[PDB]
Amino acid sequence: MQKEFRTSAYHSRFQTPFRRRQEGKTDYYQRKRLVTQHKAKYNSPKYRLVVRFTNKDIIAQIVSAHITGDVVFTAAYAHELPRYGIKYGLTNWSAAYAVGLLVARRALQKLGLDETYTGVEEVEGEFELTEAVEDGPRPFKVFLDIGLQRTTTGARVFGVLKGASDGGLYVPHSPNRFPGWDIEAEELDAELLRKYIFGGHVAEYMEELLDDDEEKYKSIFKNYIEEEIESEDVEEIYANAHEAIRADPSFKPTEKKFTKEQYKAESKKYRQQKLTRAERQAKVAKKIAEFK
Amino acid sequence: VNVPKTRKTYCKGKECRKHTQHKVTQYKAGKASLFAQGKRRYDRKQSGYGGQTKQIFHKKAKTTKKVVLRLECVVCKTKAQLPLKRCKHFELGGDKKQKGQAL
Amino acid sequence: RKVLQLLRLTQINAGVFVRLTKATSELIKLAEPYVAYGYPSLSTIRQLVYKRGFGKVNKQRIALSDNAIIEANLGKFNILSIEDLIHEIYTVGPNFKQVSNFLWPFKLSNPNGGFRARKFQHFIQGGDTGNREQFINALVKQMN
């Protein structure tokens, strides 16, 4: 009764979007605004703080864009945190802060701006931008790229923002998206932000749940229970880690149990291979014959 | 055309040199003085015999006028002038549009 | 018109030597409805240079009546004789440009015996223009 829609003319004239737009991964509007550089700053690149959250990981990368593809400057992942003393909640807001601090310190180590631009060594939750030192190199400027992730006051991407800013990177930002921002009274409650930086919300959930629903507390906070970690010693886990993160921010790759060639040989066994032209021609001939 | 009765634009006054709050008013042309030199000259030329000595415009074509906004700074009382495009209807501080309603 | 000027063919019955490349062939294709050309033999070149050979000396048309005239203008190109010049034209030599530009454009007469009944159509179609390729020698014998 109605016209069939998926005609050959519909497919012929269809203009497929960009490959990474059809995957639903790149916002090219925002990417154009982020990447494009002042044409009179000829080959000087703009550096992006790419912050991406998976279900299990926090990925923070410092990226500059080029014609052949983006180039990573440094990268810090959340699964590196166990090396620094944070083993659970690798996607906290506080894990986001730790990852931001780690990537900031690692980048500054790579550049050589460690002793200059230390950052906020005593985290009190106050809004602050890395100010340049007179008669010295300017701080490493980095712009936050939150991708498709929505901008909400209290979001975890701004945890990486605050960590990287406190780590010594100059990242332009405002404090009205941090947890503890009063929108009615336009000031930042730095006490609540400091609470969030050192896992205060998680510790308060542990304390509040333990005396109300112990069975749910046993399932949600299992790892803490078998690690004998109570609420009162949650903060130190982050507070020490920060210090440890500042002590040795260098990247240590995981020692690989197998070589590249062994990985490739193992994976190649489970990969179907395209039929040769002769194989599918023989298949067609057989299907014709069995049709008589 | 509807223009709000207040506006924050740059103030050229030496005291301000910045965006301050302004009051918007429609400019109204002043009364032609009898002692303006061009008026004094015209009256002398018109006196005596000879008839009409200067030309009188007749072939009107415009049906509108350019509205001029008088912006007075609330801080230093310095005025500024802004011409708008040709509009047949102009109100100052009318009722703002309400989108999402029925007839 | 510009192409004929760049070939130094600015009058009727004016002749010039051109070294065939892609550039000069594409030049000659534009002037084809107005010229007759072909492949000249050695004796035709010799007769042209001997009877109607003139040199460009200080922008003046000077008869090639003595080898000193040729030497004074082409000795830096190793041309010392009228036969050196003829050889340099015939076997297109490394200094063909200078030797052929030194030669003032040949001013031929009308053919003794006339043209065909109608000149201004291609030689293939029974006219006179275009490439006739070995019959340029008979035409030059008529006109030189």
Binding site: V284, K287, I288, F291 | - | -
Partner: protein
């Protein structure tokens, strides 16, 4: 009313069709383009005869109608209405203009009629029939030629009916099961696409 056709014989103007830009255009005199037994199958009428244009020219819709009527009348009178399928192969889509219906000021004309712009070698009328009915159909077209201006040739086609295949390639594709009926026309087998659907639609396909 109508000027002599000599006033509109040549393709002097660009094509001027009906569009959103000229709307008050009359209708063409020809409305029927298929005559005779238009529902006959392809195998019934193997012989095709064309009336071919030897002119770059304009033919009015009136001339198309007159020639169509003449050919149809003659062939149905001599051989019967179901012995042929006549098709007119040119549609009048070009609008002629008339000026008088001052002087040369504002002289853009009004729609006056319709004409088909035909080229050299363009087929004007096609008639599929049986072989034994050749001399009749030819004589049907030879009369229709009188209604047209310019030169037209009556050409006996090398092909089977209105198909694009020669009378020998059609027989080869027919005995090989590559041709099926589609009413008055046929569908040919394709070696591309879904193999199962291709096999189902052409059961008698002797694959090689």
């Amino acid at each position: 009313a109508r000027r002599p056709a000599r006033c509109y014989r040549y393709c002097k103007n660009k094509p001027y069709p009906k569009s959103r830009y000229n709307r008050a255009v009359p209708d063409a005199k020809i409305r029927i383009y298929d005559l005779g037994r238009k529902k006959a199958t392809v195998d019934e009428f193997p012989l095709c005869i064309h009336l071919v244009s030897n002119e770059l020219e304009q033919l009015s819709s009136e001339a198309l109608e007159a020639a169509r009527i003449c050919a149809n009348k003659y062939i149905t009178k001599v051989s019967g209405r179901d012995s042929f399928h006549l098709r007119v192969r040119v549609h009048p889509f070009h609008v002629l203009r008339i000026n008088k219906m001052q002087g040369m000021r504002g002289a853009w004309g009004k729609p006056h009629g319709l004409a088909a712009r035909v080229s050299i070698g363009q087929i004007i009328m096609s008639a599929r029939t049986k072989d034994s009915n050749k001399d009749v159909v030819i004589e049907g077209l030879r009369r229709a030629r009188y209604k047209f201006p310019g030169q037209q040739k009556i050409i006996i086609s090398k092909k089977w009916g209105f198909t694009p295949l020669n009378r020998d390639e059609y027989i080869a594709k027919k005995t090989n099961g590559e041709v099926i009926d589609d009413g008055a026309y046929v569908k040919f087998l394709s070696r591309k696409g879904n193999l199962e659907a291709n096999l189902q639609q052409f059961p008698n396909y002797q694959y090689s």
